[PDB]
mmCIF file of C-alpha atoms and ligand atoms in Angstrom:
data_model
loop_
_atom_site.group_PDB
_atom_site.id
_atom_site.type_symbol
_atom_site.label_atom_id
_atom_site.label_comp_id
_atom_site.label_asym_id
_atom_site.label_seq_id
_atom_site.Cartn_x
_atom_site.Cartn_y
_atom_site.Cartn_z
ATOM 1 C CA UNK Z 1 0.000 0.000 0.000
ATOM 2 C CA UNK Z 2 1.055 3.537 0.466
ATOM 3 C CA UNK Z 3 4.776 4.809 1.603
ATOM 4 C CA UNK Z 4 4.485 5.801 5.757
ATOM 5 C CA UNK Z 5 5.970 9.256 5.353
ATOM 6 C CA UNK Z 6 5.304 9.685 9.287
ATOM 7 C CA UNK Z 7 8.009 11.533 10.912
ATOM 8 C CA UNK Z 8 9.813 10.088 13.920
ATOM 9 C CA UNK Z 9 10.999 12.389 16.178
ATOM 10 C CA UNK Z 10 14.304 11.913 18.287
ATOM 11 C CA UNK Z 11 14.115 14.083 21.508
ATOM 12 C CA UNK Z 12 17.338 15.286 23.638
ATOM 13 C CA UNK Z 13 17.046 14.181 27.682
ATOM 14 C CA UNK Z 14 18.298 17.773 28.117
ATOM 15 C CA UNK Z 15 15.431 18.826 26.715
ATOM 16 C CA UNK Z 16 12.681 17.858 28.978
ATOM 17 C CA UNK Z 17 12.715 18.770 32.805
ATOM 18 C CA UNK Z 18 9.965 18.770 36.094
ATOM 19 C CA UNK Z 19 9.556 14.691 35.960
ATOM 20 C CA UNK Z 20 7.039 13.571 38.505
ATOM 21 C CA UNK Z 21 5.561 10.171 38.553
ATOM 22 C CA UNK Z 22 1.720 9.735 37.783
ATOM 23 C CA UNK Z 23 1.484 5.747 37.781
ATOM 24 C CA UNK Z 24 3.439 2.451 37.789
ATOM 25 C CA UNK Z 25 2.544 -1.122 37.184
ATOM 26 C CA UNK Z 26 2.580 -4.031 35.318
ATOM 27 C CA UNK Z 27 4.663 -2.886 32.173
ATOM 28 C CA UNK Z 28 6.390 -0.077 34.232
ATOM 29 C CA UNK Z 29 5.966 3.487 34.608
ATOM 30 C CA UNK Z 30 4.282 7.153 33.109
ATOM 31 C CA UNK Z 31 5.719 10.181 33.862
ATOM 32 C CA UNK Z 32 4.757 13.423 33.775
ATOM 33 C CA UNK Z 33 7.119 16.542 32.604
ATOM 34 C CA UNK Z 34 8.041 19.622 30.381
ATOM 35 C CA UNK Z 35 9.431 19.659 27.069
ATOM 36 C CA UNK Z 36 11.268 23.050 26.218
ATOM 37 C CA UNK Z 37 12.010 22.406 22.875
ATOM 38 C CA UNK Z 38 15.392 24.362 21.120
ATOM 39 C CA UNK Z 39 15.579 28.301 21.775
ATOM 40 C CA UNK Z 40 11.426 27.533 20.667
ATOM 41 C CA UNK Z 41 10.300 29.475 24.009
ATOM 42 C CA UNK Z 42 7.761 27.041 24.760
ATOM 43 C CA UNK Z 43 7.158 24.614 27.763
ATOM 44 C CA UNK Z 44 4.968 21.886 26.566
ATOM 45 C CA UNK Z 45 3.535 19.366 29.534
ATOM 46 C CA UNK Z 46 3.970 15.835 28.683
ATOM 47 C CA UNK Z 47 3.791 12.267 29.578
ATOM 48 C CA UNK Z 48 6.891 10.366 29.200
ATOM 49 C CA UNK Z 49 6.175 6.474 29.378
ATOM 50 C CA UNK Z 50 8.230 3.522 29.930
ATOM 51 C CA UNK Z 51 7.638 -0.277 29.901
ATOM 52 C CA UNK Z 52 16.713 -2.892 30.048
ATOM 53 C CA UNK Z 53 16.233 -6.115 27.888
ATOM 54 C CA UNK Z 54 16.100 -5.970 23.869
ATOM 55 C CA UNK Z 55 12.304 -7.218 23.891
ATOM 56 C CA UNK Z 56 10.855 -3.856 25.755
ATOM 57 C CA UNK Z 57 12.629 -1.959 23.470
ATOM 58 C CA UNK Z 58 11.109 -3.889 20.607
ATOM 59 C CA UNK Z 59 7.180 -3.383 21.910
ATOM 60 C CA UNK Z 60 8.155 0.091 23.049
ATOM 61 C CA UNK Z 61 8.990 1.416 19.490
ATOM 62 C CA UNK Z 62 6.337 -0.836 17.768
ATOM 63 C CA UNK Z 63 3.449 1.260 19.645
ATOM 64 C CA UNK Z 64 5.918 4.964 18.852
ATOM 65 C CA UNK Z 65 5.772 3.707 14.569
ATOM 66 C CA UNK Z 66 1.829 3.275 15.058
ATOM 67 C CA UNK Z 67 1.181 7.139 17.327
ATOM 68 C CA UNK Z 68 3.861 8.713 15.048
ATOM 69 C CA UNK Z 69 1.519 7.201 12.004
ATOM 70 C CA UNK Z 70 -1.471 8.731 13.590
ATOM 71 C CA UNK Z 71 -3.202 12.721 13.413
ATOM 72 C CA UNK Z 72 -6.392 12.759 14.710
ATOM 73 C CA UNK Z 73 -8.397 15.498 17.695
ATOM 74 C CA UNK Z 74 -9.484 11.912 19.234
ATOM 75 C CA UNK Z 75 -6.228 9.763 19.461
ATOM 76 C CA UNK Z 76 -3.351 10.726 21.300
ATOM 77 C CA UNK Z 77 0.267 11.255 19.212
ATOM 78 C CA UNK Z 78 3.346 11.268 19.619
ATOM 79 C CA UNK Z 79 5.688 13.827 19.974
ATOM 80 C CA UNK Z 80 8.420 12.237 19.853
ATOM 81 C CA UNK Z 81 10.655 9.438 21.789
ATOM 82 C CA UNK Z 82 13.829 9.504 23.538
ATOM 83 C CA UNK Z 83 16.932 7.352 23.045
ATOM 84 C CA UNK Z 84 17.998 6.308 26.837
ATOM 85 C CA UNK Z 85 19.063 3.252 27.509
ATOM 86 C CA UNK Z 86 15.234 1.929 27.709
ATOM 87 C CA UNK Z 87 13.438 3.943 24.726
ATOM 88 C CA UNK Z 88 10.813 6.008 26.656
ATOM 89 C CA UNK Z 89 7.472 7.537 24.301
ATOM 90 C CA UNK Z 90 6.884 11.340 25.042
ATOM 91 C CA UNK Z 91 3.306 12.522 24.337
ATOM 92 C CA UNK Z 92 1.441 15.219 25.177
ATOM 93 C CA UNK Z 93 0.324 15.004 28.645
ATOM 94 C CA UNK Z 94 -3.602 14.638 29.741
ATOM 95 C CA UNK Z 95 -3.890 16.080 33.054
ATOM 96 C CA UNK Z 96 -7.082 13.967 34.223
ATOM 97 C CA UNK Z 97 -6.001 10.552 33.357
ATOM 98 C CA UNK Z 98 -7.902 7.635 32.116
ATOM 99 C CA UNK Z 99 -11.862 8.003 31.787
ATOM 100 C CA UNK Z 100 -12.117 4.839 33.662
ATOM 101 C CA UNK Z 101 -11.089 6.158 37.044
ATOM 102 C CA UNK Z 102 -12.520 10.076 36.419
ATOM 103 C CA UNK Z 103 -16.359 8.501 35.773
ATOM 104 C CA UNK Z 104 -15.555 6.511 38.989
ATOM 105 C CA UNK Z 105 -13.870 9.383 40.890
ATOM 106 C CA UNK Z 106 -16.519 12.525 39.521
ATOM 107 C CA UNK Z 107 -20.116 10.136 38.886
ATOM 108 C CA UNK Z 108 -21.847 12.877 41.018
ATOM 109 C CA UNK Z 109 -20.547 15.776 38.789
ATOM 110 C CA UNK Z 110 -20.881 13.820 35.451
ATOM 111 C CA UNK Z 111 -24.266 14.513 33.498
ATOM 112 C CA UNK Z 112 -25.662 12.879 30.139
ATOM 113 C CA UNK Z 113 -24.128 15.886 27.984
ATOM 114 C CA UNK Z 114 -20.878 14.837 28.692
ATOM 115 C CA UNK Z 115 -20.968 11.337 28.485
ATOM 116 C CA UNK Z 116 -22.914 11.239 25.048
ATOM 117 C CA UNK Z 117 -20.266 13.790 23.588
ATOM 118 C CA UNK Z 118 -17.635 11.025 25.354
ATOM 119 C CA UNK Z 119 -19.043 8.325 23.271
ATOM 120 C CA UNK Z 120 -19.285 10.426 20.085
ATOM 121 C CA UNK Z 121 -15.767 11.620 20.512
ATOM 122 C CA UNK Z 122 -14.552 8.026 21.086
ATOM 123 C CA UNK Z 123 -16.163 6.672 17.612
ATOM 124 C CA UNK Z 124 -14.589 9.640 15.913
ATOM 125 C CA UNK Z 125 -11.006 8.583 17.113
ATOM 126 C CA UNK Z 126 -12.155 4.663 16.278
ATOM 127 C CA UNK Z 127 -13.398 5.656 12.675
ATOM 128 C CA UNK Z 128 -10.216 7.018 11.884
ATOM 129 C CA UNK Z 129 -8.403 4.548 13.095
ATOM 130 C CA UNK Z 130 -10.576 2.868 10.759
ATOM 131 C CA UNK Z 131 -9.810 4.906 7.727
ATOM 132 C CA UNK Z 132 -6.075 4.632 8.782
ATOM 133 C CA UNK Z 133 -6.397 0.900 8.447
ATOM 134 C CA UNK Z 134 -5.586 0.197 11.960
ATOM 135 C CA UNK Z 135 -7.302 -2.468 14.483
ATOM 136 C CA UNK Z 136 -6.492 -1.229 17.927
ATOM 137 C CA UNK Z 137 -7.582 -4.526 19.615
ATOM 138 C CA UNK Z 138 -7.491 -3.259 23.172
ATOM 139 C CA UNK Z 139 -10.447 -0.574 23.474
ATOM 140 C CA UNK Z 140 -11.685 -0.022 27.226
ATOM 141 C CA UNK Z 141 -12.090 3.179 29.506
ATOM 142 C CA UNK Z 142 -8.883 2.600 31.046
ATOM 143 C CA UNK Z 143 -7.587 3.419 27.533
ATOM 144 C CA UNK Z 144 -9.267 6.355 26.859
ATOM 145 C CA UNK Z 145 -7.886 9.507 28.685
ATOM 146 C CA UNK Z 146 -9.312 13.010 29.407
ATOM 147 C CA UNK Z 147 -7.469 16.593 28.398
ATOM 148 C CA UNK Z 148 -10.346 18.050 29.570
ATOM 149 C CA UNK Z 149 -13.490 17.040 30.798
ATOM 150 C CA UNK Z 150 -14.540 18.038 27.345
ATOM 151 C CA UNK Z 151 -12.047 16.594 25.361
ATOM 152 C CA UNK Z 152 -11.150 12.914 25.625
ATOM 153 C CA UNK Z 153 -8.500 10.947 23.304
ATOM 154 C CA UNK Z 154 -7.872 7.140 22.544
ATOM 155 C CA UNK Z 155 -4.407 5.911 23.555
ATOM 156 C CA UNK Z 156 -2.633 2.535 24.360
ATOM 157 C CA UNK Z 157 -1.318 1.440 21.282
ATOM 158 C CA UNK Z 158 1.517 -1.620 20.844
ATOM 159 C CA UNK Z 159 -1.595 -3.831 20.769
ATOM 160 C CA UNK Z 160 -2.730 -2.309 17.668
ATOM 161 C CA UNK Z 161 -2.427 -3.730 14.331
ATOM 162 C CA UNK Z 162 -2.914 -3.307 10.478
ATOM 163 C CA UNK Z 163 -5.258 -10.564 26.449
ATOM 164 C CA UNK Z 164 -8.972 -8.242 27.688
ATOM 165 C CA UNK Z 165 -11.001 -11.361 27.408
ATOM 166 C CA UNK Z 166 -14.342 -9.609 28.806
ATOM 167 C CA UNK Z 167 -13.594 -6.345 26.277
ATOM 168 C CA UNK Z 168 -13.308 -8.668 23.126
ATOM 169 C CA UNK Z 169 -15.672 -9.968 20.657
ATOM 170 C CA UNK Z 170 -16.763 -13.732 20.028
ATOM 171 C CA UNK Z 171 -14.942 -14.267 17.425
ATOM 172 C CA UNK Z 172 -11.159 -12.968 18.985
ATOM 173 C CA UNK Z 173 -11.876 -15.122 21.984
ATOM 174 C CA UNK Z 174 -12.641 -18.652 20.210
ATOM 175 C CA UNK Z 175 -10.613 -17.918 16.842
ATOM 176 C CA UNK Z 176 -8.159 -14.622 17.341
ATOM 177 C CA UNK Z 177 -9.684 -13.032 14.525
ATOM 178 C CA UNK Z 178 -9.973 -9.034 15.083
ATOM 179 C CA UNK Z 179 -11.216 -6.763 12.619
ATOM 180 C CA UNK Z 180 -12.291 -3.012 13.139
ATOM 181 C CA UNK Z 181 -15.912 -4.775 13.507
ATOM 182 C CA UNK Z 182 -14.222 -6.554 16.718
ATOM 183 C CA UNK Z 183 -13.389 -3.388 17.988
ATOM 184 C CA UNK Z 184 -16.998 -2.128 18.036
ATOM 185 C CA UNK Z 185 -17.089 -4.679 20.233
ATOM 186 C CA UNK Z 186 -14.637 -3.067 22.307
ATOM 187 C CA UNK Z 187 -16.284 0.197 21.860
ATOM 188 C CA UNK Z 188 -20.182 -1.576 23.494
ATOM 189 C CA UNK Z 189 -18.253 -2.511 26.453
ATOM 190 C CA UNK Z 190 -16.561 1.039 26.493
ATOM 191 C CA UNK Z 191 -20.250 2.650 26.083
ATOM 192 C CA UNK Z 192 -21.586 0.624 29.326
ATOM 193 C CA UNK Z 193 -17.958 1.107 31.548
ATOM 194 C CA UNK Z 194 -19.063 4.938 31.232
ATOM 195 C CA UNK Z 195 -22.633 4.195 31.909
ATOM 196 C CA UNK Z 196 -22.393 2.260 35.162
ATOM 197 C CA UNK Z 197 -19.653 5.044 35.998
ATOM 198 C CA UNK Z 198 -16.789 2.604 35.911
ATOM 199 C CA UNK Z 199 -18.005 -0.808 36.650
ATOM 200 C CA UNK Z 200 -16.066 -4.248 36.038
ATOM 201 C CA UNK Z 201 -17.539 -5.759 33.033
ATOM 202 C CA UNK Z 202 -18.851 -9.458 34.269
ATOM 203 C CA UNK Z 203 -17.246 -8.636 37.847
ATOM 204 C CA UNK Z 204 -17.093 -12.259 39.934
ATOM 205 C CA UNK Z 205 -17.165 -14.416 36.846
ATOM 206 C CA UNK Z 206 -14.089 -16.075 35.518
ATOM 207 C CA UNK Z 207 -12.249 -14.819 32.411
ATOM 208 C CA UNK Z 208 -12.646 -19.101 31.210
ATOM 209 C CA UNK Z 209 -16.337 -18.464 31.743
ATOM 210 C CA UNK Z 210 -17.188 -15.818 29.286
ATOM 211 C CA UNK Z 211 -16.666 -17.431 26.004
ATOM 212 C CA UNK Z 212 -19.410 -19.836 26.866
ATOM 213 C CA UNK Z 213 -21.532 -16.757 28.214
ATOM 214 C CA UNK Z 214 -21.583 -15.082 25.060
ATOM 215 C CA UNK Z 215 -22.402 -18.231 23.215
ATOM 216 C CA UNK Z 216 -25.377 -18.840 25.160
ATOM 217 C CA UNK Z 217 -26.216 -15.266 24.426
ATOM 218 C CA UNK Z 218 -26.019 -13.213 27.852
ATOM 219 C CA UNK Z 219 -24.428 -9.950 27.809
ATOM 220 C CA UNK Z 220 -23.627 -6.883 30.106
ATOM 221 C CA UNK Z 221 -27.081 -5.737 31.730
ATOM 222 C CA UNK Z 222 -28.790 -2.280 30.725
ATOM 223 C CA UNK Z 223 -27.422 0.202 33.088
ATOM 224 C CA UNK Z 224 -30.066 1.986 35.384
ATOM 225 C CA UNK Z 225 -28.932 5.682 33.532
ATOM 226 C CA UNK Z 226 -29.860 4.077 30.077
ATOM 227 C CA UNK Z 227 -33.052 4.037 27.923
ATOM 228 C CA UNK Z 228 -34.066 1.396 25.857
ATOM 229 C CA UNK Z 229 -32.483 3.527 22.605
ATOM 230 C CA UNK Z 230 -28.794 3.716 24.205
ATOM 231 C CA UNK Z 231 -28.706 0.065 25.582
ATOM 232 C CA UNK Z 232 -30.009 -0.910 22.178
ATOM 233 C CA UNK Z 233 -27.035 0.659 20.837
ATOM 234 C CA UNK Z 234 -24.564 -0.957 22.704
ATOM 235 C CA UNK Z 235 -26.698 -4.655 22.422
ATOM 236 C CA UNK Z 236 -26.205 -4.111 18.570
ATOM 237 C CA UNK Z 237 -22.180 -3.593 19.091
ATOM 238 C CA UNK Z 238 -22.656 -7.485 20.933
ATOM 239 C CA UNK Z 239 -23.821 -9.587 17.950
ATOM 240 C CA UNK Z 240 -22.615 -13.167 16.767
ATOM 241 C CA UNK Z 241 -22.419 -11.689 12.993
ATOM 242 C CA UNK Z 242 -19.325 -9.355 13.118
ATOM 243 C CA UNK Z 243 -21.404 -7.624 9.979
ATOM 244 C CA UNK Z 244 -24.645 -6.795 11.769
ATOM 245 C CA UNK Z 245 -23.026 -4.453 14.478
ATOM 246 C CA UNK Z 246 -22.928 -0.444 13.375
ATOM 247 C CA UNK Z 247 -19.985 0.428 11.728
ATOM 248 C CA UNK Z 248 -18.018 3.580 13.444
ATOM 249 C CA UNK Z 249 -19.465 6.496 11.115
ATOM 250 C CA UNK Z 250 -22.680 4.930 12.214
ATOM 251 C CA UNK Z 251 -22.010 5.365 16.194
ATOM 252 C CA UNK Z 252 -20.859 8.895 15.325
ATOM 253 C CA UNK Z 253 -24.103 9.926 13.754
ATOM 254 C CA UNK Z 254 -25.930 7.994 16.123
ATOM 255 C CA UNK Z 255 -24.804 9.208 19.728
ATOM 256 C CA UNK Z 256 -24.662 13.113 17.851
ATOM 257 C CA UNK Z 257 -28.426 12.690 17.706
ATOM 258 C CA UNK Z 258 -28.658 11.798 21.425
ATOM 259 C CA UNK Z 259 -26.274 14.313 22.388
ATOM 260 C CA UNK Z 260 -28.870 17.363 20.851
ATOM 261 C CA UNK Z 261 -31.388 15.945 23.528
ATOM 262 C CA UNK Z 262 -29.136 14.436 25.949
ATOM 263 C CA UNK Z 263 -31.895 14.108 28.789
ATOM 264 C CA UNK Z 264 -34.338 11.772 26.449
ATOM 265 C CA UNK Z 265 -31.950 8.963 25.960
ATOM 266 C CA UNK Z 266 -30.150 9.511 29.529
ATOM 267 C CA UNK Z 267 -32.096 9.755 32.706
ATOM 268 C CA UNK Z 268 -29.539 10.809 35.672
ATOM 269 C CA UNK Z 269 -30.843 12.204 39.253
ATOM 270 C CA UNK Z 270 -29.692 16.133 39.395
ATOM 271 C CA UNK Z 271 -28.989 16.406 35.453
ATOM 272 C CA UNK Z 272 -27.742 19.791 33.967
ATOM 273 C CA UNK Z 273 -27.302 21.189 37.579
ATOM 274 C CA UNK Z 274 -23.778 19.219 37.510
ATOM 275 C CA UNK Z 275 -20.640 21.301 36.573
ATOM 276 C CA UNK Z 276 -17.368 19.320 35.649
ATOM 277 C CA UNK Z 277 -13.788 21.924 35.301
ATOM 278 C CA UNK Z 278 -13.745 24.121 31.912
ATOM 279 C CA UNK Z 279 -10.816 26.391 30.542
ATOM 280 C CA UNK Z 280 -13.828 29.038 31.316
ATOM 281 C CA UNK Z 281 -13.251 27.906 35.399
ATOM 282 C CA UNK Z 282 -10.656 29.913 37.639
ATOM 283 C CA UNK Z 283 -7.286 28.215 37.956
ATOM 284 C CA UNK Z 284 -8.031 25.297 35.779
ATOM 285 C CA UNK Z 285 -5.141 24.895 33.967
ATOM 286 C CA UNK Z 286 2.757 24.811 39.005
ATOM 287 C CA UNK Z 287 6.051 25.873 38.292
ATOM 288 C CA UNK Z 288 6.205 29.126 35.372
ATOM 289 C CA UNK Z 289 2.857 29.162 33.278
ATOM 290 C CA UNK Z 290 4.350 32.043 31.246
ATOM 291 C CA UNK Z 291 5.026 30.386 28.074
ATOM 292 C CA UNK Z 292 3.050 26.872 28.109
ATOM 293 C CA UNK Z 293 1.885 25.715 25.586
ATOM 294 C CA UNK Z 294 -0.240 22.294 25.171
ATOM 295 C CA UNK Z 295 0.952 19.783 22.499
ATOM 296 C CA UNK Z 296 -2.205 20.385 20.193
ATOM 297 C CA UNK Z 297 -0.898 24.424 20.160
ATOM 298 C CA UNK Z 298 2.589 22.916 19.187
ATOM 299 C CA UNK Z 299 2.903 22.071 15.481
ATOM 300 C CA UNK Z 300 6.153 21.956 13.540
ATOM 301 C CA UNK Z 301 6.423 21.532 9.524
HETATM 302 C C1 5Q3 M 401 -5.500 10.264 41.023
HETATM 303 N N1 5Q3 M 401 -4.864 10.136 39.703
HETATM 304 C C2 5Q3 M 401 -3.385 10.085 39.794
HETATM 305 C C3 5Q3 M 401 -2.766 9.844 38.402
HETATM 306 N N2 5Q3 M 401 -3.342 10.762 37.377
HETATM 307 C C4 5Q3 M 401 -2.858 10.590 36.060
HETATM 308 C C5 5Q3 M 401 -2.470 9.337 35.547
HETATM 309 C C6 5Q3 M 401 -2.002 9.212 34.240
HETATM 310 C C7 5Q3 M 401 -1.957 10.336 33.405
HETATM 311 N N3 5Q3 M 401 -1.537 10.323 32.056
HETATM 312 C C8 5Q3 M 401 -1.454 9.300 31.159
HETATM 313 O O1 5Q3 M 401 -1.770 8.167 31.495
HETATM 314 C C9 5Q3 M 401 -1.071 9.587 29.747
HETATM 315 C C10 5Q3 M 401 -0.779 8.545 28.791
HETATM 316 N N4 5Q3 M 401 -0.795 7.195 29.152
HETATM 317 C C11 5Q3 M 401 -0.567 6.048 28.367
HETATM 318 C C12 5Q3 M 401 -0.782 4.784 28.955
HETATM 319 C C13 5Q3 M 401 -0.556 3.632 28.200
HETATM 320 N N5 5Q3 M 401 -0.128 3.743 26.944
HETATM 321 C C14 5Q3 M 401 0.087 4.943 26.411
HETATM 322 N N6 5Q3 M 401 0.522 5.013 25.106
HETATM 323 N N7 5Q3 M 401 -0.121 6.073 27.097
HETATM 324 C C15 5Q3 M 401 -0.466 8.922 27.458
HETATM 325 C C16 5Q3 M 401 -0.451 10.216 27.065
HETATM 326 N N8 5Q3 M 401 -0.726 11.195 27.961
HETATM 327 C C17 5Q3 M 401 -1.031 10.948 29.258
HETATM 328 O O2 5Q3 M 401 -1.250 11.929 29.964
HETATM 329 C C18 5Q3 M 401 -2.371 11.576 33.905
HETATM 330 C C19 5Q3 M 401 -2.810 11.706 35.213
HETATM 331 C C20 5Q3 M 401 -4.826 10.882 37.379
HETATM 332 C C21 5Q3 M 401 -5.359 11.187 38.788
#
């Protein structure tokens, strides 16, 4: 097919300073810091991750060729990567972290508005991915994270292509197929994490259990904030035939519908009288705030 002209860009360790930690497990760690780029006067905030042994270097720069191959307002790039002794990925930093923990952390605060324009914003970054050829194969809240309560972007790549057992469709489980159709999958298990404000998909039951779960045809229950039309939504994302679920321009146009009348397909106690942060709020966005910059702000030809 057609020639990858992505760039790959090789960052100094001189160049980026204030590293904090923001989480560590499993793989390793993320980081969070400030990229002053050249005599650019700019202070960019980003994340620096890290999963030394030839194999994490190998995964590591896998996932940096697929977010340097991607431009998109709902998937998170990369800026660039840095050449210590274990490669680390620097991208632009989301303050809030993953949507998993912030609908578990802010349910009280978090109305129908914002999570139909979450699930709209999600299928736009997924229908890209789409037109960009790539199957992300490990969609899920956790993945998802939030530069502002507003504005949330896919991430987690390394996984994607050209295990989450209870996040995966029928078909990946029994046969390891997985298609962009799989991934809608992904994205009706996404839909009701949000819903239930963070809930563990199939929580008790064995991970060897849900292959024959799905085959006798139960699936995740409607979630008390959902109407018949939303839960229908994500039911139709659950179906044997890989070709029956909506496609991603079909989610967009969907949940865009809802999210003109977000109180008739979402039914939450105290709607509209909820109020998450804004750029608009007072001291929203530590050290010298003079000439920062976020990564969407910083583009270079
Ligand atoms: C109480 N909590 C403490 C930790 N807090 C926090 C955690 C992680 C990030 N940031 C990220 O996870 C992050 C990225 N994380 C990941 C994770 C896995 N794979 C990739 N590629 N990126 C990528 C880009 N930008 C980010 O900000 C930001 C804040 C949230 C509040």
């Amino acid at each position: 097919e057609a020639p990858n002209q992505a760039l790959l860009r090789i960052l100094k360790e001189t160049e980026f300073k204030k590293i904090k930690v923001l989480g560590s497990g499993a793989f390793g760690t993320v980081y969070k810091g400030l990229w002053i780029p050249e005599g650019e006067k700019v202070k960019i905030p980003v994340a620096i991750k890290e999963l030394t042994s030839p194999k994490a270097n190998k995964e590591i720069l896998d996932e940096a060729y697929v977010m340097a191959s991607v431009d998109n307002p709902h998937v998170c790039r990369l800026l660039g990567i840095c050449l210590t002794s274990t490669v680390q990925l620097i991208m632009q930093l989301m303050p809030f972290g993953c949507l998993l923990d912030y609908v578990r952390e802010h349910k009280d605060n978090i109305g129908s508005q914002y999570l139909l324009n979450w699930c709209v914003q999600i299928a736009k970054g997924m229908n890209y991915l789409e037109d960009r050829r790539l199957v992300h194969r490990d969609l899920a809240a956790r993945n998802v994270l939030v530069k502002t309560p507003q504005h949330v972007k896919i991430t987690d790549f390394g996984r994607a292509k050209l295990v989450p057992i209870k996040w995966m469709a029928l078909e990946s489980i029994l046969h390891r197929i997985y298609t962009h159709q799989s991934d809608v999958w992904s994205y009706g298990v996404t839909v009701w994490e949000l819903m239930t404000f963070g809930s563990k998909p199939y929580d008790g039951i064995p991970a060897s259990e849900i292959s024959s779960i799905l085959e006798k045809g139960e699936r995740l229950p409607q979630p008390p904030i959902c109407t018949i039309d939303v839960y229908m939504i994500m039911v139709k994302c659950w179906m044997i035939d890989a070709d029956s679920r909506p496609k991603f321009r079909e989610l967009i146009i969907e949940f865009s519908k809802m999210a003109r009348d977000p109180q008739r397909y979402l039914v939450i106690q105290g709607d509209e009288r909820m109020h998450l942060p804004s750029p608009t709020d007072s001291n929203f966005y530590e050290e010298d705030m003079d000439d920062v910059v976020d990564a969407d702000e910083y583009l270079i030809p």
